[PDB]
Design a protein around this nucleic acid. Structure first.
Lengths: 73, 49, 49, 275, 48, 73, 49
RNA sequence: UCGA
DNA sequence: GCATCCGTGAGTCGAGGAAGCACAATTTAACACTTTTGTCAAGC
DNA sequence: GCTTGACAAAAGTGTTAAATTGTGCTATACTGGGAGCCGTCACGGATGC
């Protein structure tokens, strides 16, 4: 039984953001013009940053720092 | 003047039996806390913690 | 039928009551509580009131 | 395609015969109606064959708030008009022309339906362009473009873009839990308050006593003017027909009774009722 | 399901459960003329 | 400890009401009333007091015309 | 086009199932268009031919 | 997520 | 006829924190103009 | 005590310039979703095998 740390928990959300992006890139590279498109044509980072923003909020692991005293924090 | 001989009902949750609710005569007291009779604690199962 | 509906398995109780075209006489006290009537017990007996 | 057009033309020819009579030979009349039979079977066959193209196009539009099946069916509607408007003489594959109608049917459906508060097509059009212009300015500037940059790129005023961004607001479910759900936190605004309702009655009681001390004809003018008992505020001319005076004579009565009402003996008690 | 995979509440969901119309808004209710606070010993009080 | 009387004391006579059901709301932030629950009704029925129970569940909470009339009385 | 209530059909035991002597597995196939059903046959005309 |  | 599997239930109050255009149809505003109303002054 | 006429404001009111709104259409060829689910526990009774 292992402990998933803060850095690893964020990693899993970045993975989901990148996987959610390739669906747009894979669908974009085929039907988007030809030969001149390059990453500027279609690389939509909206799903990537959304995975980060949607994680720090609404997630049970990310909580408001509990601070009544320096001990509780 | 209006408080005089006007009863109120006190409740301590959870209410297991009917003695969890009892009527008392109010006595205006300072502060924000409530003063409870020490004998009725067994009925309410109310600790002072 | 509404006393069993408020108790448990509300979905099953409702379909059975509607199929049998059941009628509730509103006798028990849990019924009178839901409709806002005087429960038929204690001071609510047909005599005392 | 030729079977469909033949069956349609054959159907219209017989329709021209219904009004004009001229019952054709029974062998020709039976064959004409078989062409219409075959024309409809040709239409149904062409749709059932290209029912999968609709599905292959509708996969990409999911997750937007429209259920998969609804996207598929709306795409099928685009396929119907595609077959109805398709032309076989141009020598182009059917999938070439049908792709346009299926995408248009799916997108047009999303703009007219998927939003709980429906938004017209032209407003949905400006929002999507506003979003694309905002996503590109993000890639260019590395920061979210403020409305001034968005209004500039869009050829519209800055005060208009925020209003358009206000329309983009989407409703939230009252049943969302955050254990008791949000719906329990909304207080009824039109719910009657006890104090104000009881105060309004005591206020009605006080006005009766104040208005009771006055000329019976002066009190009547004030009651009709503001409506009071009736509820509909009248006008000077309407009050002039009941008391048989000109609208000017009532304004004189209205002014004299008002200065008598403003005078402190009557108004000293009504100060608390300002609000 | 709604946004974020939240199942929509249905007419049957309104009656059923501890949160339904029965055990929530029928067999119990929130009332006026009431309050709460902590309790302290009242050793000098009469039983009533 | 962070548990203080000034925060916990709450009192209400009349206040905001719920929209779908006319019962008051909960919490001190909403100025709501105390919940009289299923187990508390059992204790009220054990004593055999019908008028006190009916009062709590009608004019105290859900009766739209009864609460304004009680306040008027 | 009509629709089943799903309270009587899906609710166990199936009310439509016990009413028409139909199995729930088969009844689901019928109302959701997973298979056909014979609404009526002509027993006399079939016998003549 | 905590208090009895 | 029997057993595997679906359906229902498992404490009470609190407290708190997140594509694009064209074109026809239509309703909305915008304006010129008349009636209806509140008004000031003078005299009967 | 009331009325007059002239008088300005307001209130409509009908008519026109305008914005808003709904529907149709786009012709290389393109044809069967992807999402996911692990930690009850005890029980009853249908349903399914």
């Amino acid at each position: 039984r292992r402990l998933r740390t803060v850095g690893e928990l964020i990693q899993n959300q970045i993975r989901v953001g990148l996987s959610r992006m390739e669906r747009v890139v894979r669908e974009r590279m085929t039907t988007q013009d030809v030969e001149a498109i390059t990453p500027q044509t279609l690389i939509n980072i909206r799903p990537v940053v959304a995975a980060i923003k949607e994680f720090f909020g609404t997630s049970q692991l990310s909580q408001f720092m509990d601070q009544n005293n320096p001990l509780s924090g | 003047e209006v408080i005089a001989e006007h009863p109120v009902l006190l409740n301590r949750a959870p209410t297991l039996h009917r003695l969890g609710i009892q009527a008392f005569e109010p006595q205006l007291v300072e502060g924000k806390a409530i003063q409870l009779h020490p004998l009725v604690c067994e009925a309410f199962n109310a600790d002072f913690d | 039928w509404l006393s069993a509906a408020s108790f448990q398995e509300t979905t099953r109780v409702l379909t059975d009551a509607a199929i049998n075209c059941r009628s509730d006489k509103l006798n028990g006290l849990k019924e009178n509580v839901i409709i806002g009537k005087l429960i038929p017990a204690g001071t609510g007996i047909s005599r005392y009131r | 395609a030729k079977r469909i057009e033949a069956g349609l033309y054959a159907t219209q020819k017989l329709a021209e015969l219904a009004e004009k009579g001229e019952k054709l030979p029974v062998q020709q009349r039976r064959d004409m109606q078989w062409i219409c039979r075959d024309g409809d079977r040709a239409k149904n066959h062409l749709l059932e064959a290209n029912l999968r193209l609709v599905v292959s196009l509708a996969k990409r539009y999911t997750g937007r708030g429209m259920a998969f099946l609804d996207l598929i069916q709306e795409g099928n509607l685009g396929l119907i008009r595609a077959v109805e408007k398709f032309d076989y003489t141009k020598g182009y594959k059917f999938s070439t022309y049908a792709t346009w109608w299926i995408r248009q049917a799916i997108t047009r459906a999303m703009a007219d339906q998927a939003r709980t508060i429906r938004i017209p097509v032209h407003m949905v059009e400006v929002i999507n362009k506003l979003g694309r212009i905002q996503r590109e300015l993000l890639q260019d500037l590395g920061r979210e473009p403020t409305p001034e940059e968005l209004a500039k790129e869009m050829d519209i005023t800055p005060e208009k873009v925020l209003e358009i961004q206000q329309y983009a607001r989407e409703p939230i479910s009252l049943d969302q839990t955050i254990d008791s759900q949000l719906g329990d936190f909304i207080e009824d605004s039109e719910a009657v308050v006890a104090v104000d309702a009881v105060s309004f009655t005591l206020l009605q009681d006080q006005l009766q006593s104040v208005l009771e001390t006055l000329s019976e004809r002066e009190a009547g003018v004030v009651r009709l003017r503001f409506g009071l008992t009736d509820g509909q505020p009248r006008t000077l001319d309407e009050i002039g027909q009941v008391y048989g005076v000109t609208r000017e004579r009532i304004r004189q009565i209205e002014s004299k009774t008002m200065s008598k009402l403003r005078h402190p003996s009557r108004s000293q008690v009504l100060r608390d009722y300002l609000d | 399901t709604g946004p974020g995979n939240r199942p929509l509440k249905s007419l049957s969901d309104l009656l059923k459960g501890k949160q339904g119309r029965f055990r929530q808004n029928l067999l119990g209710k929130r009332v006026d003329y009431s309050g709460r606070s902590v309790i302290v010993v009242g050793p000098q009080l009469k039983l009533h | 400890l962070h548990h203080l009387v000034d925060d916990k004391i709450h009192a209400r006579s009349t206040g905001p009401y719920s929209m779908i059901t006319q019962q008051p709301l909960g919490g001190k932030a909403q100025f709501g009333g105390q919940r009289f629950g299923e187990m508390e009704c059992w204790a009220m029925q054990a004593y055999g007091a019908a008028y006190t129970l009916q009062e709590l569940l009608t004019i105290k909470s859900d009766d739209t015309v009864g609460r304004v009339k009680v306040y008027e009385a | 086009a009509p629709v089943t209530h799903i309270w009587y059909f899906k609710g166990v035991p199936s009310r439509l199932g016990y009413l028409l002597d139909l199995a729930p597995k088969d009844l689901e196939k019928i109302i959701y268009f997973a298979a056909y059903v014979i609404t009526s046959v002509d027993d006399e005309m079939r016998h003549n031919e």
